[PDB]
Structure formats: structure tokens, C-alpha cells
Design a protein around this ligand. Structure first.
Ligand code: DQV
Ligand SMILES: *[C@@H]1O[C@H](CO[C@@H]2O[C@@H](C)[C@@H](O)[C@@H](O)[C@@H]2O)[C@@H](O[C@@H]2O[C@H](CO)[C@@H](O)[C@H](O)[C@H]2NC(C)=O)[C@H](O)[C@H]1NC(C)=O
Ligand SMILES: *[C@@H]1O[C@H](CO[C@@H]2O[C@@H](C)[C@@H](O)[C@@H](O)[C@@H]2O)[C@@H](O[C@@H]2O[C@H](CO)[C@@H](O)[C@H](O)[C@H]2NC(C)=O)[C@H](O)[C@H]1NC(C)=O
Ligand SMILES: *[C@@H]1O[C@H](CO[C@@H]2O[C@@H](C)[C@@H](O)[C@@H](O)[C@@H]2O)[C@@H](O[C@@H]2O[C@H](CO)[C@@H](O)[C@H](O)[C@H]2NC(C)=O)[C@H](O)[C@H]1NC(C)=O
Ligand SMILES: *[C@@H]1O[C@H](CO[C@@H]2O[C@@H](C)[C@@H](O)[C@@H](O)[C@@H]2O)[C@@H](O[C@@H]2O[C@H](CO)[C@@H](O)[C@H](O)[C@H]2NC(C)=O)[C@H](O)[C@H]1NC(C)=O
Ligand SMILES: *[C@@H]1O[C@H](CO[C@@H]2O[C@@H](C)[C@@H](O)[C@@H](O)[C@@H]2O)[C@@H](O)[C@H](O)[C@H]1NC(C)=O
Ligand code: NAG
Ligand code: CA
Ligand code: CA
Ligand code: NA
Lengths: 209, 209
């Protein structure tokens, strides 16, 4: 393991402007120095090489507008859905059933979720989505459960940010907070997603029903 | 917990013993011994193999019979998730050279997932963890694309008491054929035992010209 690929030593942070010691190389775009060590977060991050095989400045050079602190991450086209052979996004409008569990790295003003437990690398997220903004939600990780059916854009996640992607994303037409407001999602606390059976599916009916 | 606590005292009630080393002596219920090492143990960390059901309940719901002659019933539309009009969500997509895929199953089949996808994201029955070739414990195979080729690519519908919602790659030619024609190569476990080997070096960064 370790924070950087072995090639990056002895100066892995060369080219990075230090800003704040909470983050890798002092740069919030490179995510937090400290990573989760409890289930399920550690399970979702077990396959996560933060910069792939790149070093920090190469990673920022590739995926952001500038290695300097003013550089912003560039996001994939077509809302990050994987593209078919004709460059069109693969997705469909789909009804999320009551009982389905969803999770998300990001504030509740966002519109992108994944099925509960998807690996971080399946989400094609940059390292900064693991930064903590509310101490009640370390690593900006939120878990929800569908309390009333609603329709979302549903489809595969394109590779991005030096990761393979290919999770499924749910792109909502109301942001998360709005969906909670209107009774479509409820928040789950950690006791509701800390055992294996709580990842299983009781709501989908069988073929013989 | 192998069985949900609700199934005690006698979880194997209704199951006919057939073969030892399988849960309740029934190969449809998968092996007793589950994988002990990364990445397989990472892929099964969220797997409750019957959900909240007891073995006979699970077979009654998902197979044609609890008796040994029962066979698992599979989801329609080749297991793709369905949109609000009951059409499968998928597109034809080019898999790029370098992409890593994996699969629980034999090389005569056609369904793969992105390397590292959780077992519950694949909506597979317990018997896809059965070992048929000691060279491949749990029938777990990993591949890398060596020449680009087109697959059906889409979200995985929930089935078998699991949420699904990984992405599946549905090949037009079985795995063995694709290896033989030079589209896939087999990976040794040494080639997927480190986090960096799950990252993506082949997808290019956005154009900034
Ligand atoms: N296996 C995974 O890891 C996986 C990844 C992503 C998604 C999925 C999910 O798998 C589900 C399908 O399961 P199934 O066992 O049918 O897959 P697979 O093993 O690839 O087989 C495909 C078809 O090819 C035929 N055939 C396969 N072997 C032989 C053989 N030795 N001899 C003769 N014919 C054979 C047969 O029609 C079979 O149904 C589907 O619902 C899908 O959602 C799994
Ligand atoms: C690094 O900066 C943070 C402040 O960052 C802001 O607040 C975060 C919650 C998040 O919104 C970031 O994106 C923001 O840029 C410092 O956090 C403060 O730390 C002081 C410690 O003296 C503490 O008193 C305050 O409570 C913190 N402020 C907030 C708003 O939480 C942090 O200390 C900085 N790191 C270092 C090493 O100084
Ligand atoms: C599971 O076992 C069966 C054999 O039947 C079981 O074992 C007996 C010793 C006895 O205890 C029975 O009551 C059990 O039900 C295997 O089926 C045999 O397979 C071989 C090789 O393929 C074949 O030559 C025999 O004809 C088969 N016998 C029958 C009755 O079909 C079966 O292969 C085992 N399955 C697994 C996954 O191990
Ligand atoms: C598939 O098998 C079931 C169950 O078979 C019985 O139980 C097994 C464990 C073993 O002991 C078999 O030899 C048994 O016949 C069949 O279910 C029927 O179960 C009823 C229950 O009242 C019993 O009366 C019958 O005799 C069985 N039916 C027959 C013999 O026609 C089931 O029929 C089998 N599969 C199909 C497609 O019918
Ligand atoms: C995806 O493309 C297939 C056809 O792709 C060709 O055939 C495959 C077997 C494989 O060799 C590919 O590399 C080829 O490019 C479409 O299948 C056709 O669909 C139409 C209408 O749905 C049907 O009438 C044709 O007979 C199908 N062809 C075959 C050979 O079955 C498929 O529709 C495409 N899927 C999407 C979502 O665009
Ligand atoms: C972004 O900022 C660049 C200059 O940043 C400064 O120089 C670099 C080398 C670092 O030392 C950094 O800490 C400094 O703040 C500009 O050259 C560039 O044009 C700016 N980008 C935009 C889009 O304006
Ligand atoms: C999904 O629904 C939204 C809102 O109703 C609509 O704007 C969009 O075109 C639909 N997309 C598909 C693929 O049906
Ligand atoms: Ca719990
Ligand atoms: Ca290795
Ligand atoms: Na070096």
C-alpha cells in the first residue's frame, strides 16, 4: 500500500502547492490523508488507488484544468454515463422500488447516487469527494432508502479520474435533499447498513409470484 | 452469519441432502467454505447468500422446486435492468484495450462484470460460487482486453434476493472464443492482487487544447 505509487518518491508532492495539511500534499483536490478503516467504507475503498499509477501533479495535469490550486476537475460528458458505439449515453428512465438502498459520496444537493455498497472505483469520482464537510458524515458518505417510488435516469458509469467506473448511477431530477423533503428517500444511520443481510434485497418479487 | 438468525433452529428444513461440502448438502445453495483472501473476500463482504430467507424459502422463490430436481429461474431480457416501459437498458459498447473484466462461471458463458464488482451486484445464485476446476476456486476468472471488441453493456437487474445494479458485459462470443481469437487474455492472481491493478491507465484524459 502507501499514499503514492513507488515511482513518485522521494518527492511525491513536487509541483503541488501546499494549501492545508488535512489533504494529500496539502491539496484538497487530492483528497484526505486519512482514509476510512471501518465497514462498509473500507470495503468500498479496498480496490482504490487514489491516483492510479500516476503521481499527484500528473493526476491533476490529466484530470483538472491546472496543477496550480486554481485548477478544477474536468468531468466526463453526457453526465458521466458510459457511451455506446454511436457516442450516445447508455441509460433509461427507471422506477426505483420502495426498500431499495442507495448511497452517495457528496452533499445532499447532488443528483447522482449508486446502489448501496458500490466500490469507490465504480463511481468514477475524484479524490476530493472523500473530503469531510459535516462531521456527522465522515468522508461525505450518505446512505438512503427509497420510501416512495420515483423515476431516475439509470445506467452505467463511464470510466474517469484514472478509475474504471462501470458501476450503475442513478441520476435524479430532484436533488437528494428535495427527495428527502418530499418523502421519497429517508436517511439510514450506520446501524442500518452494518450487517450483510442489510445489503440483500427483500423487495424484488420472484418469478413464481 | 451463514443463515439468518430467524432460520434457527433447523435451517436446512425441507432440503434433501445430496452432496457434502455444499450448504445443506445442496449444490444449488453454494459451498460451505467461502473465499479467504483478496479480492474474492472483498467481493463477498456484503453477501448474505439467502438474504433474509431460509434455504427452502429461497429455493421456493427463485427455483422451480425445493426438491433436488428444481432449477434456478433466471431474470428476463438476459438480466438487464428494465426501464419504465419494461425494455432492457443497454447499448453496444467498445471495450478498450487494457480493461479488466471478471466472471464467476465457466468460459463457455458470456456474462462478465468490471473487475472487482461485488457478488451481490451480479444477481447470481449461490451455485455460481461452486468450484468446477481446482485451477479456478469458486469458478472465479479475471480477464484483460487485448483487442477491442463490442459487447452489450448495461445495468444488472435485481434477482436471487440481491440488489444487482452492477454493470454486465454480454459478449456475442463465449469467453473461450474471445480468448482464442485474441480479444481476451487470462490474468494470474498476481495481476490483480494490488490496488493499483484495479485502477485505469487506458482511458485518456479530456482534451484541453
Ligand atoms: N458470471 C458473472 O460474473 C456475471 C456477471 C454479470 C452478470 C451476470 C448475470 O449472469 C446471469 C446469467 O447466468 P448464466 O449462468 O446463464 O451465465 P453464463 O455462464 O455466462 O452462460 C450464458 C449462457 O450461455 C449458455 N451456456 C453457458 N454455459 C454453457 C455450457 N457449458 N454449455 C452449453 N451452453 C452453455 C447458456 O445459455 C447460458 O445461459 C445474467 O442474469 C446476468 O445478469 C453474471
Ligand atoms: C484546513 O481547512 C479547514 C477549513 O476548511 C473548510 O471547512 C471544511 C468543513 C470544508 O468545508 C472545507 O472544504 C473548507 O475549505 C480547517 O478546519 C478548521 O480547523 C480549525 C482548526 O484550528 C477548527 O477550529 C475549525 O472548526 C475548522 N473549520 C471548519 C469550518 O470545520 C482545517 O483546520 C485546515 N487544516 C489545517 C491543518 O489547518
Ligand atoms: C452429487 O452427487 C451425485 C451422486 O448422488 C449423491 O451421492 C451418492 C454417493 C449418494 O449419496 C446419493 O444419495 C447422492 O444424491 C453426483 O451424480 C453422479 O455423478 C457422476 C459423475 O458425473 C455420474 O457418473 C453418476 O451417474 C451421477 N449419479 C446420479 C445419481 O446422477 C453428482 O455429480 C454430485 N454433484 C456434485 C456437484 O458434486
Ligand atoms: C421434483 O421432485 C418433487 C419431490 O419429489 C419427492 O421428494 C423428493 C425429495 C424425493 O423423495 C422424490 O423421490 C419424491 O417423489 C416432485 O414432487 C411431488 O411431490 C408430491 C408431494 O405430495 C409427491 O406426492 C409426488 O409423488 C411427487 N410427484 C410425482 C412423483 O409426480 C416433483 O413432481 C418433481 N418434479 C416435477 C417436474 O414434477
Ligand atoms: C447491437 O448491435 C447488434 C448487431 O451487432 C452486430 O452483430 C453482433 C452479433 C456482433 O457481431 C456485433 O459486433 C455486430 O456489430 C444489434 O442486433 C440486431 O438488432 C436488430 C433489431 O433489434 C435485429 O433485427 C438484428 O437481427 C440484430 N442482429 C443480430 C445479429 O442479432 C443490436 O440491436 C444492437 N443493440 C443496441 C442496443 O443497439
Ligand atoms: C492558474 O494560476 C496560474 C498561476 O498560479 C501560480 O503559479 C503556479 C506555477 C503555482 O506556483 C501557483 O501556486 C501560483 O498561484 C496561472 O498561470 C494560470 O493562468 C491560472 N489559470 C487560470 C485559468 O487563470
Ligand atoms: C427521462 O425522463 C425525463 C423527464 O421526464 C426526460 O426529460 C428524458 O428525456 C427521459 N429520458 C429517457 C431516456 O427516456
Ligand atoms: Ca444493523
Ligand atoms: Ca500484482
Ligand atoms: Na522516483
Amino acid at each position: 500500500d502507501s499514499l503514492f505509487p513507488a515511482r513518485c518518491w522521494p518527492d511525491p508532492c513536487a509541483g503541488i502547492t501546499f494549501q492545508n495539511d488535512t489533504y494529500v500534499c496539502g491539496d484538497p483536490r487530492l483528497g484526505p490523508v486519512v482514509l476510512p478503516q471501518k465497514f462498509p467504507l473500507n470495503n468500498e475503498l479496498r480496490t482504490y488507488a487514489r491516483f492510479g499509477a500516476l503521481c499527484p501533479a500528473e493526476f491533476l495535469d490529466k484530470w483538472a484544468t491546472d496543477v496550480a490550486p486554481n485548477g478544477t476537475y474536468i468531468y466526463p460528458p453526457a453526465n458521466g454515463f458510459a457511451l455506446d458505439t454511436e457516442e450516445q449515453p447508455i441509460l433509461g428512465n427507471a422506477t426505483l422500488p420502495v426498500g431499495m438502498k442507495l448511497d452517495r459520496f457528496g452533499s445532499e444537493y447532488g443528483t447522482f447516487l449508486a446502489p448501496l455498497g458500490a466500490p469507490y472505483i465504480e463511481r468514477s469520482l475524484p479524490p476530493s469527494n472523500l473530503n469531510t464537510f459535516d462531521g456527522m458524515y465522515p468522508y461525505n458518505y450518505h446512505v438512503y432508502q427509497v420510501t416512495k417510488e420515483f423515476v431516475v435516469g439509470l445506467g452505467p458509469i463511464a470510466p474517469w479520474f484514472e478509475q474504471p467506473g462501470m458501476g450503475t448511477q442513478f441520476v435524479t431530477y430532484t436533488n437528494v435533499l428535495g427527495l428527502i423533503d418530499d418523502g421519497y428517500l429517508r436517511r439510514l444511520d450506520e446501524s442500518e447498513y452494518d450487517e450483510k443481510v442489510e445489503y440483500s434485497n427483500p423487495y424484488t418479487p420472484g418469478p413464481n409470484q
